[PDB]
Design a protein around this ligand. Sequence first.
Ligand SMILES: [Mg+2]
Length: 244
Amino acid sequence: KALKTLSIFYQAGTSKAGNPIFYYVARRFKTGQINGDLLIYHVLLTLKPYYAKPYEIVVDLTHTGPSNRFKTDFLSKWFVVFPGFAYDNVSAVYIYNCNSWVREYTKYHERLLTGLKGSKRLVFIDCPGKQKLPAATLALEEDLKVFHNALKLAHKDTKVSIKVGSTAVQVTSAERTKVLGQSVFLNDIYYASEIEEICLVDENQFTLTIANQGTPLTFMHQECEAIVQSIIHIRTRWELSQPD
Ligand SMILES: [Mg+2]
């Protein structure tokens, strides 16, 4: 009932600047499955012996989606449950593996997150170099087929790379996009278990419907056939490994 909530947030290491570092692993928190107040209380007790002095936070957003989200009314609680100095004493916030969903999440909540907008303390890490299946770590360490110069079609199209592993698919933005007032790179991660549909529209276009996420993704690339075919391959390999 408890330990299940310590992997989400914990203290570990000391910043190069000599400050205590804390990690929030976003994908550990499942809204509805984990009591909100329990998590806050955990976080508070963990920060209590430190947050009177400068400290640093590492937000881990890899594979963060709707199920990892804070409901609006729960998000608000975080803005008033800590003493004032606790917010001020945060000297740095390193954001890791921010993705398309988080961007929409922060835009939807932009009026609440005004304080973070274009903040000097928020550092978006633009490259990773700085019985339960890991999945996330396996996906980021397995061999890949990389399709560069792809095009993600949206309100404004964006250069992206499409990386197909054996268990997951990554779409990495090749050009910066606006997030909380900053130009950053995004890295989406879709487990083969999340690809509900994958339709090949033409020789160099295709769509990708992600489970639990409304609007299907649309891409363009010279070798859309090979891309679509390899993704279908891993989706199949996953379905075959599921219990009958
Ligand atoms: Mg999800």
